[PDB]
Each structure stands twice: as C-alpha cells, then as structure tokens.
Design an enzyme around this catalytic site. Sequence first.
Site, short mmCIF file in Angstrom:
data_model
loop_
_atom_site.label_atom_id
_atom_site.label_comp_id
_atom_site.label_asym_id
_atom_site.label_seq_id
_atom_site.Cartn_x
_atom_site.Cartn_y
_atom_site.Cartn_z
N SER A 142 4.80 1.18 9.96
CA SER A 142 4.29 0.14 9.05
C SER A 142 5.26 -0.11 7.88
CB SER A 142 2.91 0.54 8.50
OG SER A 142 2.31 -0.55 7.80
N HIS A 180 0.82 -1.19 0.00
CA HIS A 180 0.00 0.00 0.00
C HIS A 180 0.87 1.26 0.00
CE1 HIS A 180 0.41 0.05 4.52
NE2 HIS A 180 0.38 1.36 4.30
N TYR A 227 -4.93 -20.91 -7.62
CA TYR A 227 -6.08 -20.38 -6.90
C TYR A 227 -6.77 -19.22 -7.65
CZ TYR A 227 -8.76 -20.04 -2.62
OH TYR A 227 -9.76 -20.11 -1.67
N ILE A 235 -6.58 -27.05 -4.97
CA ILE A 235 -7.19 -28.34 -5.31
C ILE A 235 -8.73 -28.31 -5.49
CG2 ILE A 235 -7.52 -29.12 -2.92
CD1 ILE A 235 -6.38 -31.86 -3.89
N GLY A 236 -9.36 -27.18 -5.20
CA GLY A 236 -10.81 -27.05 -5.38
C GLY A 236 -11.68 -27.97 -4.53
N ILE A 237 -11.42 -28.00 -3.22
CA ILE A 237 -12.18 -28.83 -2.27
C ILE A 237 -12.53 -28.09 -0.97
CG2 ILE A 237 -11.87 -30.75 -0.62
CD1 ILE A 237 -10.77 -32.43 -2.88
N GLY A 238 -13.81 -28.08 -0.62
CA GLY A 238 -14.24 -27.72 0.73
C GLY A 238 -14.46 -28.98 1.55
N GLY A 239 -14.33 -28.87 2.87
CA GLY A 239 -14.49 -30.02 3.75
C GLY A 239 -13.99 -29.81 5.17
N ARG A 240 -14.32 -30.73 6.06
CA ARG A 240 -13.90 -30.63 7.46
C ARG A 240 -13.43 -31.97 8.00
NH1 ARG A 240 -15.81 -26.30 11.81
NH2 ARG A 240 -14.26 -25.27 10.47
N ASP A 280 -0.06 -7.76 2.02
CA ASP A 280 0.37 -6.36 1.89
C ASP A 280 1.89 -6.20 1.95
OD1 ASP A 280 0.11 -3.55 1.53
OD2 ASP A 280 -0.21 -3.17 3.66
#
Lengths: 299, 299, 299
Positions: B161, B57, B297, B213-218, B87
């Site tokens: 910063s 920034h 991604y 990898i294009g996967i959601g899950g728990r 950033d």
Amino acid sequence: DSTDETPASYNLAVRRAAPAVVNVYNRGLNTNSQLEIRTLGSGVIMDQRGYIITNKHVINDADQIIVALQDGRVFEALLVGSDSLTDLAVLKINATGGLPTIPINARRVPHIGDVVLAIGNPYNGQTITQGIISATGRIGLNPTGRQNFLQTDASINHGNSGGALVNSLGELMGINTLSFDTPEGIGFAIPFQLATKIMDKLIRDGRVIRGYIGIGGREIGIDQLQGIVVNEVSPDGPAANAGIQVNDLIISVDNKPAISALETMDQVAEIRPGSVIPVVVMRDDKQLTLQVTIQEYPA
Amino acid sequence: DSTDETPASYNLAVRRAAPAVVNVYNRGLNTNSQLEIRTLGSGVIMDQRGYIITNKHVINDADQIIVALQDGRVFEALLVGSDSLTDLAVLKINATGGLPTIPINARRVPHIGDVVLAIGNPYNGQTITQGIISATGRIGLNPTGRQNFLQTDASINHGNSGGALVNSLGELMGINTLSFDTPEGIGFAIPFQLATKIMDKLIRDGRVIRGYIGIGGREIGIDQLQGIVVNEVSPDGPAANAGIQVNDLIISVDNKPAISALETMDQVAEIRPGSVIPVVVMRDDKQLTLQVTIQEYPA
Amino acid sequence: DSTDETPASYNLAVRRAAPAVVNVYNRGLNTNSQLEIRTLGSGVIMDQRGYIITNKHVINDADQIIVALQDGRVFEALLVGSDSLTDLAVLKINATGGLPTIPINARRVPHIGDVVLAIGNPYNGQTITQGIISATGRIGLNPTGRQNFLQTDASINHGNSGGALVNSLGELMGINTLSFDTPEGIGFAIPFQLATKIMDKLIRDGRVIRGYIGIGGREIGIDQLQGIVVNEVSPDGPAANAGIQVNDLIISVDNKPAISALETMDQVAEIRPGSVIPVVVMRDDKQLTLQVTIQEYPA
C-alpha cells in the site's frame, strides 16, 4: 524507452466476450405505487434467439426480471426455468436487430494451466479477474457427484457470479458460480459443455429431469471382469421392482459395460423416466438379464 | 531439457520500477531520551526534485518521517500535504546526486485486461503481486464520486500500500491504496493521471481545494436537448445566491454543455473558489444566463 | 475466428511436473479390527531412489503412511525424519520399475516476477494455482531467521501444501508450506536449494542438527573494519567457555570475515557440533584468537 513497446495484456479476450455479458436485475414491487432492486447479478447471452444464462440465486422470488446490455439496450426477461443443484437459470428476451453473443468453440478442449478471465457486469464498466484452470470438471448430472465443477483461482465474487469464464481467445470455458459454503483461493464454474446441456433441457422441459435406478454399490488385470456390486437396493425403486438383489454384480446397463460406479450413475441420470432398459447381472455364477423402468430421482 | 529455455517472467518491469519504490517510516518520540516506529509503508519517487507519493494513513501523526532507498540511502522527509478522500500524501526530500524515479508514460492508455504488478517495499527485498486491470478508474475530484479508483485483482495489502502499480513495461498505472472497509479479490489504486494531478495541487496549495456549486439534480434521441434538472438547491450556496431555483433545467455550465450529472460535478470540482462563471438554464421555456461565484466544498 | 488460434497456457509446466506430485495419506488404526484417514496432503518425488518430501504436519502421529501416484501405483512409506522449524519431512518408498521425478535445475536462478504454479494433489485430478515470485528466500538454517521462505501470491492451501512450486518450464522452485499464523494474498514455500539441503541432512542424521556459538550481538566506508560487537554471552555456552566477553568485536569466525550478523549466524548453524574453530576478536585494541568448540542449538 518503453514508448515503442506493447504491454502484456488479455484485453483481446475482453473485447470479444464482454459485450455478451449482461446486468441482471431482480426487482420487487412493494405495494406503494414502487420498483426497487432486490439484488443484482451477471448473465451471458448464449445465442441470437435471446436465451441467457444467469444464477438461480440472482433471480429467485423476482416480481420482474430486467436485462441491460453494455450497448445501452434494456429488456424485460421471461424466466424459462432453473436448477438448484447447479445454481443455473435460463432467461429469454425478445430483441429486434442483432444481439452480441458469447464466443463458443465446441471443439476446444480445456487444459489445466490454461489462462482464464472471469468476466462480470455488476453495475455496468465491468469487473474482471484472471487466473488459470486448476481442475477440469465432469459434465455429469447425477445429484450426488461432487466433481461437476471446473475449478479456478480466478476470483469469483458477487461482481462476476453468473457471468462468463473465458480463455485468452475469448472462448467460453464456463459459467461463474459463487460458492456459499473448500480450499482458500479456489472458485468454481459450471463447465461450458454442462451449461449448454442444462440450457437445452430447461428449454424443452422447463426443469432438469434426472433419471434414477435406485441402486447403491461399489466397483469390484484385464482378465478379471469389472462390475458394480449391489450394496443396497431402494424399496419400491426401479431395481427392486425389476428383481435386482443385494450382492448382485452389475456388468451392463443399457448396453454399456459397467466398469465404474461414477460413470454408470451419470449415465442413468441422462435416461428419461419411463424408459425400459436391459440390465445384465451375475448371480450365482449365472447371467440374468432384467428389464428396468427408469424413474425420476427423488427430491 | 529445460536448461536451454527461458522462464516466463515479469522481472523486467520490476528492474525498471522497483528502484523508485521506497520504505516510509512514521517515527514517534516518546519522552524517554527514544525513537520508535509507529508504522511502516511504501512510497514512490515521482521526480528528480525529490517529491514522493505515499498514503496519508502511513504518515498521520508522525513526529519524524524517514525515507529509505533500495540503494541504501536514508533521508528525512518534509510533509508537503495530504488528502483524506484519496488517502494520498506528498513528501519532499533533498538529495545530492541523482534519484531513481518511477517510469511514467503520459501517452499510455490503460486497458482492461492489462497485466499489472503491485510493488511494495515494506521492510526493504520487496513484496510484489500480479494481477490485471479489472476496471479503469475516473480521474474526477468530486467528493461524492465512487468511481475514481482503478480496480485490480493484484493483491493490495500492508506490504505494498502506497507503492507503485505498473504494467509489464514498468510504466506507472497507479498508486496502491489499501481498502479499510466490496467484492472479495478486488483491490484499488489511484489512477496515475489523478495521482499526478493531486500531487501538483498539494505542491501549490498545500491541500486539495475542491469547487462547489451547491446543486443536487439528475439528467433528463439527439433532437431532444439533454440537461440536468435541479432537484434541490443548497441554502446560502452559490446557486441559491445566483437565483437558481428547483425545476430549473441546466443546459450549460462555464460554457460546457451539461449532458451528464457526473461529468458536470467533476467539472465544477476543478473550478477554483472565487471564480465567476456563466450558467445557462431553461425556465418557463425561456433561456436565462446566471452569474455564479464558485465556493469551496463544505467539509 | 479463433478456431485457428492457441490459448495462452502454462499446461507445459503441469505436464512436466505434476506426475511427480503425490497424494500422502496419514492413517490411524482404531482398535476395531479398522483403517481410517486422519489427514491428507501432497508430497514431491525427489529422485529415483524413492525419497519424497512432504509437510511434517501432514505425517505427525501417523500409524501408517501411504503414498499414491497419478499413474495409479500405491506404496507404503517409511518416515526418514522431519523438522518442525521448516515443517518438512522426508519419506522413502521402495519401487520396482521407474519413478517419475520432479524436474530440478540447480543452475537456475529464481527471479522476482517469475511466473510460478503451485501444484497439489489432495484427492488425486490435481489442484493448481498461479502467481509470481514475490520475494526470493534465504537458504539459512539459523533458528531465529525470518527470511528463509520464498514468498508468492500463488494461492497456498490445504490442497497444495507439501506439493511443488515450479516455474513455467516445470523446474522446482520450492516446496509449498501452508502458514498457520502476514500480508493478505501472500503464501510461502521452502526455497528448493534449502529443501534439498534439509533432505540430505535428514537422510544422514535422521534430524536437522544446527550449530550454536551462544552469542548475541549486532554489526558495528571501506577503510573502517566491519565486525560484530558482542552484546551478550550465554552462560556455559561455547563462547563463554572459550573466554569471549561482552564488548568484544568479532572480526572473524572459522576464517570467514564477520561483516554481517545474519550471515555469520547462518554460517555457525551449518557447523557440526564438536567442531573446534578459530574466532578472532578485537579487545582493548589488541587481536585475540580464541578456540571455540561448537555445540548444538538448544531446543
């Protein structure tokens, strides 16, 4: 080369104390099934019986109270009681096998300038801040007293509120209390001696019962006798009922000389309602001993 | 008499570190001639080749980037690359004669409670604050992770910063990052091991390339096998293309046992797109090994 | 067991310093009788003659100024003088028997990174905060200078403004000054060497008298002669009256080589009005010595 050297650190206090600082979850039951989290906060395990101190504002209106330890154990808690004026509440869990407890040294005298860490456990890692003791607190229970908080410039926030304030040895100096209202950069904690007193009271009575004599007034060399002049007397209060009048000079309460208005009111607050005590006054240059039945402070 | 005594001080860390903390100027060219300063910030010299880390920034939309050293030297900088999510940005200067560099100990393990100084150089004296490490950060690159920041109660502001966070030995613990959005009194820095990783990636690719990898899950005792249940599968993603289905149980990714959803996603993020890896799943109580081509991604 | 151990503490600095930090009360007389408190603040006892430094904004428009000591003594104060630009004021009390005074070491060199405590006495216990020296200040009196403040991340607030900033030995590093307007987490104090200078001036003149030469301008290897080029000359000012013209190069003021615009203007500010000084300039490759009568800086 700094390979050989040792960084300045308070990590020792963290290792001794942090294991006793817990996550506290306030969970509501919507009528769907489902269990949702209303709010989150920190708490402190005070002893091996499983008593825990947290903030009242964290557990208000909870359908279920859940406690989670740094070591992975999760418990359902019972609310023992709370107090609005100090924003403290006590919980109890039933644990098999040992519990980690906060180090407490009752002989330790807190000093202004002592380094303190304010230890939270908001999401369970932990959120920890560093500062000093800015002002020591009083341990009084009189409701009108403003001085019953320890002050610190260690940052007190939603992360660590309800958790432990400790010195560099990991000894408990207070319970962190977030201010909802004072100078910028100053936070507050309940002094540890006041916090244990409040816990013991909640455990026996389920609430903090404060004594009341129903008197307003202010203090008058060593050869002059100190006392408290009665400015006003509460109608149908203990003093009024006992025959105490305006312009009376209170020289003694329950056998303690009354040399300070602040000390004597904290004294009365500790006296259990129903108690009958002597109060000695000076009226018209004569001593009078009056018998006063203490009542409970009005809400 | 205090004439004989020595004041408590962190000045040693300042002397070792501050010379490598630079002023960074973002300059625009208005069409007049003239050169004007759009914004100012801090940066850190990472090595003798002249690579510098600052905030993205601070250098956004710069027509010219100028670097100034505490020793008086002024350089024009080349932007190597940047990353919005952390950033961070990397600059390069060409210097004859030595450069001061930030002390780095890769063997040093940061501990919660360690004292830190946040060193800035906004106008060139310097602006320095003191606090402790409140929470150590993860060094993950998965975009959805919230835990990849070191937390500190050392004050982080426009002054410091982009500058260095160091311990009392002057060793780099992180890069200061101002928060534009969390608990009062808490600031953030990129952990130094994550910052050097990001720098190396920018130097070779010009940007931070994250695997997907294009996967959601728990996540689902030691005698039970841990795994990740697939909640959802991204259409036209690597997993979908490889034949992975909902309710699959992922027990292994690229030969690493999958015992945590967070660890496995940081693992995948490090894998370069185009890579073909084995993923072992349990379906209908049978083992299946699937071959998955990692993608980048989505923005 | 921590029973044997000693907590980390700055209590020593508090014991040495705090007794000299006083409550200052600004009291108005409403025409009723009555005496009411307009505002409250802190002050510092500088010596045994009873001179005290506080903030100007605390004593503005006071009908009566009252000082209260930690040891219980209460005094009426005389206002000696004040200065808006530094927000300092000096008071005097007449005391029989000794006074506690702030420890001062004139040989002590403040260092960036030194630990400091900011000591207040708002209500009389005291409000104390801890931080470090972020930047050392200049001790200049030129009115346009922005750098004449010590910067610290010790919290500076209504509690401790006007009180003492000390190191861990209890030695005075500055006078706390609350900012009414800079980076978050940074407070300010008047460096102690500037504060004593201002006090001495108020005691002899009743106000801070600043010298003025009426010149704007900026600085031009060792083989090149440094100087200040005259950008503008104030009409009917000291320089204009003496014959100084635009594009003149000032190489010397009052026998001091002029190598910096900032140093030379702080130099002129210390010179008493009515003083006649030599100023050497280069014009048309020739040296000219001009005689300039210093005036007082315009309000």
